Amino acid sequence: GMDEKPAITKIISGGQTGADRAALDFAIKHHIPYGGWVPKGRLAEGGRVPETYQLQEMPTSDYSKRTEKNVLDSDGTLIISHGILKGGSALTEFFAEQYKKPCLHIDLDRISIEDAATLINSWTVSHHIQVLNIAGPRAGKDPEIYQATMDLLEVFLA
Known about the structure:
Elements: E1 10-12, H1 19-29, E2 34-35, E3 37-38, E4 56-57, H2 63-72, E5 76-81, H3 87-98, E6 103-107, H4 113-126, E7 131-135, H5 145-157
Parallel strand pairs: 1-2, 1-7, 3-4, 5-6, 5-7
Pfam families: cpYpsA (PF12694)
């Protein structure tokens, strides 16, 4: 029923700039537990993911392998973009599809943040998603994705 709320016990991401980084900053701001797999060496656009973020390194520096691991080590994956998925974000969706993990792609060129938050609520509650992987483009590909992600999560969980 509508009395039930999402039970997000943990947010994870791959530490990249953009959507991944907003997810972690949001979790920290709202004292939601967080984590995530990053490449060996904590590699990211813009340099080593800052040490203040408690994250786990993969055995190799490969981006694709850490994206795959975050899909596998969560209850579902939320992908946030402006426009159709490309690159790492499209790969995220492919991995979720291949491993039968719940996956919701919010395209913030097609839906408002308020309406998207409603969709995320319905999806998380109906699929009992508690450990949520959040993915999307790096900041160098979309200068608006970090703040859009923050703003979306605020409507969803704040």
